Design a protein around this ligand. Structure first.
Ligand SMILES: *[C@@H]1O[C@H](CO)[C@@H](O[C@@H]2O[C@H](CO)[C@@H](O[C@@H]3O[C@H](CO[C@H]4O[C@H](CO)[C@@H](O)[C@H](O[C@H]5O[C@H](CO)[C@@H](O)[C@H](O)[C@@H]5O)[C@@H]4O)[C@@H](O)[C@H](O[C@H]4O[C@H](CO)[C@@H](O)[C@H](O)[C@@H]4O[C@H]4O[C@H](CO)[C@@H](O)[C@H](O)[C@@H]4O[C@H]4O[C@H](CO)[C@@H](O)[C@H](O)[C@@H]4O)[C@@H]3O)[C@H](O)[C@H]2NC(C)=O)[C@H](O)[C@H]1NC(C)=O
Ligand SMILES: *[C@@H]1O[C@H](CO)[C@@H](O[C@@H]2O[C@H](CO)[C@@H](O[C@@H]3O[C@H](CO)[C@@H](O)[C@H](O[C@H]4O[C@H](CO)[C@@H](O)[C@H](O)[C@@H]4O)[C@@H]3O)[C@H](O)[C@H]2NC(C)=O)[C@H](O)[C@H]1NC(C)=O
Ligand SMILES: *[C@H]1O[C@H](CO)[C@@H](O)[C@H](O)[C@@H]1O
Ligand SMILES: *[C@H]1O[C@H](CO)[C@@H](O)[C@H](O)[C@@H]1O
Ligand SMILES: *[C@H]1O[C@H](CO)[C@@H](O)[C@H](O)[C@@H]1O
Ligand SMILES: *[C@H]1O[C@H](CO)[C@@H](O)[C@H](O)[C@@H]1O
Ligand SMILES: *[C@H]1O[C@H](CO)[C@@H](O)[C@H](O)[C@@H]1O
Ligand SMILES: *[C@H]1O[C@H](CO)[C@@H](O)[C@H](O)[C@@H]1O
Ligand SMILES: *[C@H]1O[C@H](CO)[C@@H](O)[C@H](O)[C@@H]1O
Length: 458
């Protein structure tokens, strides 16, 4: 099913991208629409986050050999030159504040209604998407495109992150004003790979270099001692697919099981995995009768009331993806570790789990990775059960009966499927430099640095 579903996923995404995507007539060239739904709910807009996550996926597929995605990527780049310059209710380009705008109309005009703005993850995610393509351009002799177009676009977004990271905004769910794990994690990543891109184009990013370790320093605060807190400050539990998404979208296939960057196989992210997934076990009738060793439908956070509070396709896929990422890392390392922090995670899947280090050649490793693989597959199977017979995936599936609800054909659901399927196949993205960006400063500073903002014309 995964193979055929991935086929539908690629084409479905393109159907949601302007100008010629079949489901989104009216959308400009290179504009990713979140869903073709214009009513109940109205998702016929372009979000900087959704577009950036979708484009990262496309760039990764393109770089792995899917070369026909070229014009789609190029079109996105062109669109973003325009989008960055749209004065909007978050602000303008000159001050940088405009880059924090969550969403835009599909014809590249400001969305003027009230909204949970700014959302500071956007510029980080766009930079991350663009950098990947900048890397490819350099590798294939397109130096002028990488240096004159991609870099200046990236430079605006890196400047935004360095200047504004230490300010409150809304989370990825657009609901909680504060400071959010997912946002901080992806911002840290963006500054690190952004600095390396700057060097590669014969430039520099001094604001990237000074701010990255401070963002990482702050990121440590999200560890509660048993899971990763989603937001400061909230009276929710803080258990949130937010933190699964933070881990998988900052996964570096070169990384060890680093707690400081909450890598998928780190004891912190594994402990968090169990806490987040477990929060959905009792609250959905869809999960009735399943035991703690079995996968379940996963929503956003247990307190969610959006459409009554339901499982989400992308959140269930994130639970699978972190595990596939852990499997890849454990295999690359040639070992797996059970710690006091991660013991409960392991014990639920393998009853005889005990603290220690088990070699890939070893017997214990085999039993654990087998259980982990089956568990991860369990999440994908639930997704497969609730996708339409033609492969369509909405935003949500029903907490009681698994019927699809909210926005139909959610682009981000398709991207999540493609990434989850890839990691299951041991297909991993380019490294982002985590191996020399996991050192936490002794003392954290509430600070910023100033870059440069300049309008790009393509
Ligand atoms: C697998 O099979 C699936 C089943 O067939 C299939 O899903 C279907 O896909 C088609 C598209 O080919 C959808 O058709 C659209 O239906 C719109 C109205 O849908 C409502 O009513 C339906 C009938 O009762 C319901 O089924 C439907 O429920 C679904 O959606 C809910 C909300 O998201 C969701 O909660 C449900 O679970 C369920 O999924 C829903 O309630 C209809 O409005 C729309 O017409 C537009 O688009 C046509 C072309 O796509 C144009 O011909 C037409 O003129 C309309 O165009 C306007 O809107 C477009 C964007 O959507 C723009 O591009 C156009 O330019 C134009 O925009 C103007 O107008 C806008 C306001 O109207 C305005 O905002 C703009 O500014 C501009 O002025 C279309 O016919 C169908 O709904 C899907 N059915 C289901 C069950 O989901 C799926 O695609 C298949 N999957 C694969 C992988 O192949
Ligand atoms: C801008 O950057 C600064 C510097 O990084 C950053 O300051 C830090 O904020 C965090 C989060 O508020 C602080 O950590 C807190 O410390 C207080 C006081 O001791 C604790 O009560 C808090 O406990 C909560 O979180 C714990 C997990 O860390 C949970 O276990 C617990 O139950 C509570 O939920 C919390 O640890 C940190 O001390 C400061 N550091 C400094 C140097 O001030 C600031 O938040 C950033 N602001 C924005 C908007 O980005
Ligand atoms: C993460 O990165 C730091 C340096 O920033 C290393 O010292 C650490 O071992 C890990 O690779
Ligand atoms: C690892 O590196 C960071 C800076 O990247 C330092 O703050 C830390 O003290 C250690 O040298
Ligand atoms: C925040 O604080 C740091 C010092 O830790 C400065 O480098 C920066 O300019 C800002 O004032
Ligand atoms: C970000 O904020 C710091 C204060 O910590 C300033 O020094 C800096 O100029 C930038 O505005
Ligand atoms: C800042 O940089 C941009 C992108 O290169 C230019 O278009 C602008 O004129 C300014 O120099
Ligand atoms: C940079 O910003 C300017 C001013 O909004 C635009 O004219 C340009 O197209 C780019 O977006
Ligand atoms: C790119 O260059 C054009 C000039 O053609 C400017 O108008 C725009 O603001 C952007 O800097």
């Amino acid at each position: 099913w995964l193979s055929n579903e991935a086929t539908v996923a690629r084409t479905a995404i393109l159907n949601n991208i302007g100008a010629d995507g079949a489901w989104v007539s009216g959308a400009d060239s290179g504009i990713v629409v979140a869903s073709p739904s214009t009513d109940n709910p109205d998702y016929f807009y372009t979000w900087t986050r959704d577009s950036g996550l979708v484009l990262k996926t496309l760039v990764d597929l393109f770089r792995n050999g899917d070369t026909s995605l070229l014009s789609t990527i190029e079109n996105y780049i062109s669109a973003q030159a325009i989008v960055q310059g749209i004065s909007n209710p978050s602000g303008d380009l000159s001050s940088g504040a405009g880059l924090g705008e969550p969403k835009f109309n599909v014809d590249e005009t400001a969305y003027t209604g009230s909204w949970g703005r700014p959302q500071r993850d956007g510029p980080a995610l766009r930079a991350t998407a663009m950098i990947g393509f900048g890397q490819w351009l350099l590798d294939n002799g397109y130096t002028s495109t990488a240096t004159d177009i991609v870099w200046p676009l990236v430079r605006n977004d890196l400047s935004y992150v360095a200047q504004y990271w230490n300010q409150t905004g809304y989370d990825l769910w657009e609901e909680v004003n504060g400071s959010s794990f997912f946002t901080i994690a992806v911002q840290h990543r963006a500054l690190v790979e952004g600095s390396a891109f700057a060097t590669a184009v014969g430039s520099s990013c001094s604001w990237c270099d000074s701010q990255a370790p401070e963002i990482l320093c702050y990121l440590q605060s999200f560890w509660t001692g048993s899971f990763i807190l989603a937001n400061f400050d909230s009276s929710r539990s803080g258990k949130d697919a937010n933190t699964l998404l933070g881990s998988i979208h900052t996964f570096d296939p070169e990384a060890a099981c680093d707690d400081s960057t909450f890598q998928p196989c780190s004891p912190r992210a594994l402990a968090n995995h169990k806490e987040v997934v477990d929060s959905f076990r009792s609250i959905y009738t869809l999960n009735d009768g399943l035991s703690d060793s079995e996968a379940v439908a996963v929503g956003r956070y247990p307190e969610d009331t959006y459409y009554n509070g339901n499982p989400w396709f992308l959140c269930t896929l994130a639970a699978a993806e972190q595990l596939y990422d852990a499997l890849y890392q454990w295999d690359k390392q040639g070992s797996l570790e059970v710690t006091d922090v991660s013991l409960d995670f392991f014990k639920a899947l393998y009853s005889d789990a005990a603290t220690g280090t088990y070699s890939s050649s070893s017997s214990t490793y085999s039993s654990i990775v087998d259980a982990v693989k089956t568990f991860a597959d369990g999440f994908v199977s639930i997704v497969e059960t609730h996708a339409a017979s033609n492969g369509s995936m909405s935003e949500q599936y029903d907490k009681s009966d698994g019927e699809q609800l909210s926005a139909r054909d959610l682009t981000w659901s398709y991207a999540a499927l493609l990434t989850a399927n890839n990691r299951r196949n041991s297909v991993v993205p380019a490294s982002w430099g985590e191996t020399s960006a996991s050192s936490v400063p002794g003392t954290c500073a509430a600070t910023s640095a100033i870059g440069t903002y300049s309008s790009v014309t393509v």
